[PDB]
Amino acid sequence: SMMPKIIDAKVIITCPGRNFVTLKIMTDEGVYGLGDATLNGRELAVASYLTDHVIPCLIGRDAHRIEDLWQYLYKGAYWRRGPVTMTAIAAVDMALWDIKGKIAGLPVYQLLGGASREGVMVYGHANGTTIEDTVKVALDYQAQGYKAIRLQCGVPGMASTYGVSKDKYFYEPADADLPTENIWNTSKYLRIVPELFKAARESLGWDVHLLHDIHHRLTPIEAGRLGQDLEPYRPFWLEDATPAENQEAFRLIRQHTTAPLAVGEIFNSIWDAKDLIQNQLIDYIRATVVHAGGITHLRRIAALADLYQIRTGCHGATDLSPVCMAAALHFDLSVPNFGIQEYMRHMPETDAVFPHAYTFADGMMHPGDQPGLGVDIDEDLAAGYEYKRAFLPVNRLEDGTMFNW
């Protein structure tokens, strides 16, 4: 019945504890949709991609035509793929699915096949300077009812490492108006992680799922070894073992370890993962609605993965807004090959700016049953938190060589 045309769209930028960029699409029927467009450390490039280029092309279009607009933006940009490009496309896609649900009077998961499960298992983030500190935090997460917990500890002798900070229920690495410089030592790291997992199993037991993020810092043969060393402790996954622009990079890892492997939070399209999937080089795909081209495209990534029993493990750090989390949870509740959802808690100010229907209890989340995504933005409140430039950190080897953070 309702046949809404897009009449206006705008980018809202706000910093309630950290930067978020949001797309709002309005139709002539008064129904609107929201999409996350946040790209941590490069936020204003996406805002411009949208405001200056994409939005003008949205005006007048049939909001029902989700696939058509996806293809129009993907093919029509001419220069294909990429983090800025695909995040802009995701934002439009999310917003259109939001609108579709509102028109249908159904939550988005009902449009994607309905619920495949009763709730969405998440993991939280235990970090500490020492192994003892890390295990103590993990015990707290376990008591709170988390079924899965990521472990990150300090590397002895090294001032910093990925995932360790003063924050407990999250990790906010974009912490400075210029990139914070870190120093990395692979040898020390390879020896500490197995000791961490040993101590963790001793205190937590064997039912809880234990995860670890390598954060791009190993070569393939080094990752193969870390895998071998962690097998005794049965990790749920080892994530981002080695840079993956070359999709053959995981071959040596898979040849040498049975530790389950996860990758892809920085992937922006199926083309970044096609060979990793088809060659059975990974067990979990980490791509997200916001960074890999929205619900439309993420469903295709998941479908390819399903053929090889690879499961979804969407990235869920703080730099994905509650709009992204809402979309992710609708995707998670409905996708058949769901694995796990990452859950870092947002600041209270963030929750206030983005009121939402999704809930967390007893280690499980649910997207809620409001029409569409079940999320909104309080524009008046958002206007009170001005953008503040903040970069992700960089990492160098001890001789000064640029390395992977």
Residue appearing with tokens 């791509």? 287
Residue 297 or 346: the one with the smaller Cβ distance to Cl ion is 297
Rounded to a whole number of angstroms, the minimum distance from the CB of residue 294 to Cl ion is 16
Picked from Cl ion, Mg ion, a copy of itself, none, the partner binding residue 283 (CB below 5 to 8 A depending on kind) is a copy of itself
Among 85, 161, 312, 341, binds Cl ion (CB under 5 A): 85
User: Min. distance of Cβ 45 from a copy of itself in angstroms?
Assistant: 4
Catalytic site residue from 212, 215, 291, 366: 215
> Which range of residues in 80-88, 182-190, 303-311, 315-323 is near Cl ion by CB under 5 A?
80-88
Q: Does 342 belong to an annotated binding site? A: yes
Contact in structure between 196 and 129 (CB atoms under 8 Å): no
The C-alpha atoms of residue 242 and residue 345 are separated, in whole angstroms, by 27
Q: Where are the beta strands (DSSP E) in 269-335?
A: 284-285, 311-312
Q: Does 229 bind Mg ion (CB under 5 A)?
A: no
Q: Cα–Cα distance between 319 and 174 in angstroms, integer?
A: 9
Q: How far is the CB of 370 from Mg ion (least distance, A)?
A: 30
Q: Which of 162, 171, 284, 343 is catalytic?
A: 162
Closer CB to Mg ion, 286 or 297, in the complex: 286
Is residue 162 annotated as a catalytic residue, yes or no? yes
| Chain residue whose CB lies nearest Cl ion | 82
* CA of residue 296 relative to chain centroid, distance: 16
At residue 383's C-alpha, the angle toward residues 40 and 69, to 5°, is 55
- 172-176 — which CB contacts under 8 Å span 24+ positions? 172/18, 172/318, 173/392, 173/393, 174/18, 174/19, 174/40, 174/41, 174/319, 174/390, 174/391, 174/392, 174/393, 175/390, 175/393, 176/390, 176/391, 176/393
56: tokens are 């003008």
Q: Is 74 a catalytic residue?
A: no
Is 315 a known ligand-binding residue? yes
Between residues 241 and 353, which has the closer beta carbon with respect to Mg ion?
Answer: 241
Q: Where are the alpha helices (DSSP H) in 144-207?
A: 186-204
Binding annotation for substrate:
40, 125, 265, 286, 315, 319, 342
Binding residues for Mg(2+) are: 213, 239, 265
Q: Which positions are annotated as active-site residues?
A: 162, 215
Contact residues toward Mg ion (CB under 5 A) are 213
Which residues lie near Cl ion (CB under 5 A)?
A: 82, 84-85
